[PDB]
Each structure stands twice: as C-alpha cells, then as structure tokens.
C-alpha cells in the first residue's frame, strides 16, 4: 500500500503510517529488481529482519530526481531546508 497506490501525498505534506505489531521481510524488497536507490542508514537490511524495534515508521512523497539527494542527514537544498529535513542521527531506510 505504501509502495503501490493510485496517488500519494506530496512532499509539501508527507504522510506517516506508523507500521507496527507485524512481521516484515525487508529482503523481499531488497531483492526487487525495480528499486534503484536504497540509502538505508543505521541498521543493515541483512540484520533488519532479525533486529526488533519499537516501531517501523513509513513515509511517501514525490520529489525530483536530482532532489532525492536532499533527504539525508546533514544535507542542505531546496527540499531539505524547506519541505522535508532529516535528523543528523537518522536511522532507517530510503528507497527511490
């Protein structure tokens, strides 16, 4: 649902999902042959399945190809400074 749908929220207001109380197989998404960018900071995907966390949040928004770069910690840019900024201690995964 958070990966394939008719329309998602735009970068001006990205939506949060609060995915929890369920199991996940991150390697299924890892092995997919359509996702290009997988800048997933913090816990490695190979141990992401085994590692248990309090919650796994979700995001979805539309940004330019050259402005995908602006969703990383310690970053400046048009989207990064104005629409969406990431904490310097970020932990999670990013897919584009």
């Amino acid at each position: 649902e958070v990966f394939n749908a008719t329309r998602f929220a735009s970068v001006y207001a990205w939506n949060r999902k609060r995915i929890s109380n369920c199991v996940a197989d991150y390697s299924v998404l890892y092995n997919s042959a359509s996702f290009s960018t997988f800048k997933c900071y913090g816990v490695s995907p190979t141990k992401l399945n085994d590692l248990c966390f309090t919650n796994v949040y979700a995001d979805s928004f539309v940004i330019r190809g050259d402005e995908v770069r602006q969703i990383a910690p310690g970053q400046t840019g048009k989207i990064a400074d104005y629409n969406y900024k990431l904490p310097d201690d970020f932990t999670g995964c990013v897919i584009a």
Partner: antibody
Amino acid sequence: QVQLQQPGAELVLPGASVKLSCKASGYTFTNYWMHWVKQRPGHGLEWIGEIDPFDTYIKINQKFKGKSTLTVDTSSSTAYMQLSSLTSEDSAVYYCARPDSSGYPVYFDYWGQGTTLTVS
Amino acid sequence: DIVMTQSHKFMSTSVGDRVSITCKASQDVGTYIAWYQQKPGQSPKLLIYWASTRHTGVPDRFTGSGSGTNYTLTISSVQAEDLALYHCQQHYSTPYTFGGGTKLEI
C-alpha cells in the same frame, strides 16, 4: 575512539595466495558493512567489493572479479581476503574502508591503515 | 558503470590562494560525488562527505559545489596540512569508482 588496525607487509611469490585481515573496533560490527579499496599509485584507488557481516552476501566489482574473495568472521570483528595466483601487476596496498552507514550507496567515511601487497 | 576521471592532473597554488578542484563524471548522475584527503603515507581521510555538505571535523576552508555534471570544490585558503591527494567517487550505484587523485604542492 575508532580503531581499524591492519597487519600490513604482505609479500608472497607469484602464483600463490596470502591472507589479509581487517580487525574493527570502536563501533558496531553488526550495523556497519565492510567495504574494501586497493590503493594503486598508477591510476589511483579502486573499489573491490561489498560484504555484509555474519552472512555470505557477495557483490564483487567488475574490475576484480574471480581472484577477489570475501570472508567475514563475527568473532574478533575480522574480515578476510585470500587472493590466489597474485601476479606482479597486483603489487599495491589494500585498505578496508568503513562506510558511514551499512546501506548502499555510501562514501566510506573512515579508513584504517593499509596492508601493502608486494612481490618479492 | 560510472567512472571517475578528474580533469586536474596537478594543482599548484600557494598558501591562501582561491582555487577549485574539478572532477568530472562519466554521465549525469545528479550529485553523488565524495571527497577524500590522502596525505603521502596517510590513508585517504574524508573531507567533504558529499557534493556540497560538511562532515564533522572539517576545516572551514573546504567547500564544494555540485553542478550535476562537473563537480568542483573551491578552497579559499591552503595550509600545510592540506598538502594531500584529492579523490572523487560516485556513490550512485553499487559498483563504485575512484578518481586518479591530485597532488598539491607549494
């Protein structure tokens, strides 16, 4: 403080294999992938491949396919290479590069010492 | 894959001079270039972890710019410790490539 020590001073006659170690300390061996870079003065640095800890996920750079091998042991936080049939064109220095995160793409923020490969 | 071929074979600038380090990219990868400081006899040390950002422990002299295809790093002043090698890498895809390096001298 982050410690990434290297044994260094690796010399083997051509046609044989040598063992390289990369002991990591000062951070998490679980949450940090291991990436390798070889320093050649002729044309600068180059990427070897990527290995995940406590598993056998293999991704080898198209430049050093075949000879390059990836081996990681959870105990002692040591990652290994045993490159068989080293030639006289392989005389250079090996560095194991720690990345900022364990998710590609990365930029290998912290590099340790270098293990020199030399043919005698 | 994307291959790094820097355009500055050597850089000859004095102390405090304003000059840029230009490295090209094989194709338009947007902005995914990184920089390292490799002193002679020293492992390459991260200087600007991204195209135009600033990592921890960075001298204020280093500041890069990303035009999309021709990435440059402009340095207002050059000190003794800056005498090292400059490397560019593409963190866009899995197969990584490194630049040839540039030696700085007075």
